[PDB]
Amino acid sequence: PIFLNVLEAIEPGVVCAGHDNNQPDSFAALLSSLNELGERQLVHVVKWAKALPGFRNLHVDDQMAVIQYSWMGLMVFAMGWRSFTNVNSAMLYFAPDLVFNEYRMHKSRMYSQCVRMRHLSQEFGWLQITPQEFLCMKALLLFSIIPVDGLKNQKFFDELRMNYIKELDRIIAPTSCSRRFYQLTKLLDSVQPIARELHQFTFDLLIKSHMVSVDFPEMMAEIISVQVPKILSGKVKPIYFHT
């Protein structure tokens, strides 16, 4: 199954957040540490993406574009998985040195969102998702948000996407092998409104970040200020399986 080989091979490892657990759980520290993590996990997302099958066939601006649009969802999906596998979904396994219990969920002022992410995590258990399914689904997520008028080379993108769908089809490869497809497509859809809420939250946060002493690393601030607003303003949209 050459495609799995790749996905299993290139899957990024553990990434620590750099969080000082000796300090108390302030809003500023939890959030500056999550911003750091984000910047760290983006390095790995980039390296991973470049090594995906067919990915470097996309025009290079498209390449950068889809990474910058889809990092949240990708990162949230992978964090849901880690939480499922390491803490059976009581808490949120952001990094081994940044595990959110409920207190941290409240202190982050993103309790609401963290509730939605914990559901996502539970669903990994609820649905008995295999590692191979996770991987194929996670890759699809890279190809699940685009400009509404399209990318420079949109035809190559649609083809690639098609192909990642068939792979998820294949790893599922006729009443379960169909109702299953319904379920995972459903689960993938569910990532989008959660990422939507985090985009809104982080963008709001970056705007008021001098007022609250929250540090945003360089590329995170660029992406939040240039790219995220295209999603928030409706210029860039998720692609859903189901309407």
Partner: peptide
Amino acid sequence: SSFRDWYT
């Protein structure tokens, strides 16, 4: 952009 230059 800083991303445009890291990625290339």
